[PDB]
Design a binder for these strands. Structure first.
Ligand code: ZN
Ligand code: ZN
Lengths: 111, 180, 104, 69, 127, 127, 104, 180, 111, 69
RNA sequence: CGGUUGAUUGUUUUAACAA
RNA sequence: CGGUUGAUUGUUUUAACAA
């Protein structure tokens, strides 16, 4: 798995914007938000599922990494059991095609 | 000692998961060690609310700096706070306690803020290692805050439903976090 | 009023009570060495304070040479229409000592 | 690459690699994460990236690692 | 090193504010003390003077000067504010105790209470 | 979608605080309104109820419920706090205007002023 | 009291007055679509407000289907011991309209 | 409108170089554009002091957020501040003004904070480019603040020595900074 | 000249500690502090002269650098007209031999 | 090394180098500063460092620079 | 996202405004 | 560093404490 080092403030802004756009703005209401307690991995902060046709794009935010504790983001395309690591550049187009500032993977992932 | 009962009841509710308490209220009192006994400071106690950019811990630090406490005396500071201190607040309180060895701090928390977050866990552990005492606010300190910091106008304290169960659950969570 | 100060009176320095004792000693030594900083001595039993403002801010002296580890203070002042003197001394370590009024 | 986590650091690296049940980080802000399978020195890992099945192989004493299809 | 010696009575911030507000109220709203001159802090060469009230008594004047940013006191709330009262005539100044100052004020001049130096300077933390 | 309809009089924060303090003062300090029941905000299933005052009138009760965190009003200081007054008897509730509520209070019950609903609910920003 | 509301009365929506008008329209549409959020309508000339709390918080309806670009509101309530109805309508664009009391 | 005269005289002294003014005082007033005329808001005006970690600009931003100003109305906000905003304060005010186009801001400064610092110069220039009007507080606005925000109890305003000279010098410095 | 990129907060802490130790603490009272207006270079924030016997160590803080405006520190030993660029490691010993935390070049310069 | 200050950036580099009266930065947080003499592409600069007279020489299109005694 | 609230949703943040 | 103040020195930061 590829994890990009990110500050906690950017993670908080990302999760706040995601919650806003699936609940209040409802522009991304089709998305799913999985909390920490629904994940078996103790290091996973949160999961964001973006439905893309049959497939789905999963953005997983991690906390408690020893990179002194660090946080990270992992983008992963999922076609049923099939999975693939995705760079932010591909995720930008993948989100723009099928879909407060909009929640963009590039802004959160960029250093 | 000027706090309306509605604010206290809303903010100091001890339910472990409370989603619409966006402000942090911190009541503080200071005691001085004189002749081997801890005498309360009547005018060195109060309560402060929170701002989006200014947390109550920073305001209390500024108040302590303005108080000009004698360095040759021992002070014991009791806190009653609705949310447990965040990472930045715990960090700053830890370094302040390290730089101020003549004052000790005990903290009672109505709720644990992000008790499932590893970052908040290490912040709380560092604050505890700095010498601060972290406790869960039970019915006794709730009544003490009602009769001391709350402008109840003589009204008796009315505990909310499930106060003891929430207190026990938060005590267990705090014991797990602090690795007692 | 005069008798209360003349009979029993003790003075102490509390310029920086939030700082460590060594830093307090250093600050007091500096303020006594150069006349660019005020020095205040508080009566222990009351709120009375004797402040030595520099002459630029408006036979009175503060000195260390009389005794090692001690500060001696002489302050003539006209109080209630009668001239009086304030004689005091505080030692370096404890920043405490004896100060009292006399007739000159 | 470089490990992120001196004698205590290398002892932790060694016992974490020998026993497992922990996460291992290798930064390049790109970083490779090694998680235990229950949560779901030479390093070799098959991983699908951008639709192709690339394999990341490297070594650490600091070290060097690269991905090849 | 030349020094200027003044007897300053340490008084907490609340009493200083109450004294200032009472004096200003009795100078303009209830003009009983309308002859009192209130000189501000920027008119004095002393950098640690907060306020200065001049009370004309005959051909002399009773000056009550309140200081801020002084050295901390022994008590908790003696944070660096004080009051010094003096009586000056023809460039001859003598320090005056608060009781004598109040006696002079009541001799020459005499609901919100009237401004009294004794209440301002009294130490409520030492008794 | 099923809705519950209530007439809420928008009142600024200062008047809400004054009403609460006056009611609590007359409940415990000056026990003229000692029969009034003050139910706190956590005893109501409505998440936007700040306070609830029960006034027994015979076998019925006049309930004055103050709400916080409502929608903003047209005026500047209608920031989301309001008051609704109703009269209930045997699970039959009817909304009551503030004037009628004050008339009932003075009929059954009647220095800090006595708590009046008309003063609390009157709009000082629209007149 | 009844005549003041019955004779002349106009209502408007001011739920989020600090937000742009399009966001206000979207928020009002959402709150009307799902009965999980309160909707308040303020009389322009007074401080009177009609609040439609969800039934979970304790023949009254809010609807959009009657006319495109309009919201129709029916609220029966017992006021001062007599049952009355509140009939209102506000259009989508301006978040404003007419609302008044009648006898049912 | 509750400000003691001593605080105003000490903090709002307009000497360009003032070394012992460690706190920032900001008086604010708001006007609303109704029927083509600007009507003053009597209850939307006041004054706020500064904290070591909390600047008055952030407190004013929080107050504006709490005010719930209508987005369909034009607001004109006048500031009278003892020190010109720092880099962080100018940054935050610039982004707030960019995100709030329905409100305009005019600022009068008693003194220019670090007017020789290039960082503060670019901060002030960015704040001006964001739409804020920066002016030097002359005798007229000093008298206005004395009669409006200062609890003078009817006492007349007493200007300090060299007020006009300091105002002219600060006007020249501000003109040089803003590249008029 | 060698300039190390530093945040403005560290520069402020350095200048505050230097002023403290030459004025109040008087542990470094022999040092000299040259302000911006006494320097011909418009980019110089401040200068700190540390007398080291006959020679002197000059620490110059710069602002307004286009590195978007950046600040920097330059350490330079001076023996009369002779001058030399000095790394923080040598300056540590040079200060410790002849002389709130103490003002250390390494802490300010380190990234 | 790399210049710190795209078309506007290179135009500013060019005219600043041609005319002068400005500071030029070259980061490696070590950085080389070129100041006009009145304040007191190939790059060459004599400079005394740690008691020795080293000479720093480099080139920029980004670039490469090194110091040699 | 006023809910088996996972907590920066529309903040509930205020010593006297009716002494 | 209360000074030809170059400004995070010992902050001067407070609506009623004597209504
Ligand atoms: Zn916090
Ligand atoms: Zn600022």
């Amino acid at each position: 798995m590829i994890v990009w080092q990110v500050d906690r403030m950017r993670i908080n802004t990302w999760k706040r914007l995601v919650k806003h756009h699936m609940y209040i703005s409802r522009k991304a209401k089709d998305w799913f938000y999985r909390h920490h307690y629904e994940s078996t991995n103790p290091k996973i902060s949160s999961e964001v599922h973006i439905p893309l046709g049959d497939a789905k794009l999963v953005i997983t935010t991690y906390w408690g990494l020893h990179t002194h504790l660090g946080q990270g983001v992992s983008i992963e395309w999922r076609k049923k059991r099939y999975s693939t690591q995705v760079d932010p550049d591909l995720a930008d187009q993948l989100i723009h095609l099928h879909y407060p500032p909009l929640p963009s993977v590039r802004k959160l992932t960029e250093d | 000692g000027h706090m309306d009962p509605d604010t206290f009841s809303y903010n100091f509710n001890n339910r472990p998961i409370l989603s619409r308490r966006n402000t942090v209220w911190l009541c503080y009192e200071v005691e001085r060690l004189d002749n081997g006994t801890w005498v309360k400071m009547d005018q060195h106690r109060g309560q402060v609310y929170s701002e989006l950019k200014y947390h109550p811990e920073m305001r209390f630090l500024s108040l302590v700096s303005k108080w000009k406490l004698h360095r040759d005396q021992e002070y014991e500071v009791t806190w009653y706070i609705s949310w447990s201190p965040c990472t930045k607040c715990a960090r700053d309180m830890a370094t302040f306690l390290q730089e101020n060895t003549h004052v000790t701090l005990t903290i009672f928390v109505a709720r644990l803020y992000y008790f499932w977050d590893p970052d908040y866990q290490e912040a709380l552990r560092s604050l505890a290692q700095a010498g601060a005492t972290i406790k869960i606010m039970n019915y006794d300190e709730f009544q003490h805050c009602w009769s001391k910091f709350v402008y109840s106008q003589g009204a008796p304290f009315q505990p909310w439903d499930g106060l003891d169960e929430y207190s026990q659950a938060l005590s267990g969570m705090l014991g797990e976090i602090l690795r007692h | 009023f005069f008798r209360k100060l003349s009979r029993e009176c003790e003075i102490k320095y509390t310029g920086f009570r939030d700082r460590p004792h060594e830093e307090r000693q250093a600050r007091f030594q500096n303020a006594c060495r150069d006349g660019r900083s005020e020095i205040a001595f508080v009566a222990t039993g009351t709120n009375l304070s004797l402040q030595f403002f520099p002459a630029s801010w408006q036979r009175e002296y503060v000195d260390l040479e009389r005794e090692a580890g001690k500060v001696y203070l002489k302050a003539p002042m006209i109080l209630n229409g009668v001239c009086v003197i304030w004689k005091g001394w505080i030692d370096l370590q404890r920043l405490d000592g004896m100060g009292c009024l006399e007739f000159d | 690459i470089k490990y992120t986590g001196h004698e205590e650091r290398q002892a932790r690296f060694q016992n974490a690699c020998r026993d497992g049940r922990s996460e291992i980080a290798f930064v390049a802000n790109l970083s490779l994460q090694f998680f235990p399978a229950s949560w779901q020195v030479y390093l070799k890992a098959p991983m699908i990236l951008n639709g192709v099945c690339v394999i990341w192989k490297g070594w650490i004493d600091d070290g060097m690692g690269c991905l090849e299809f």
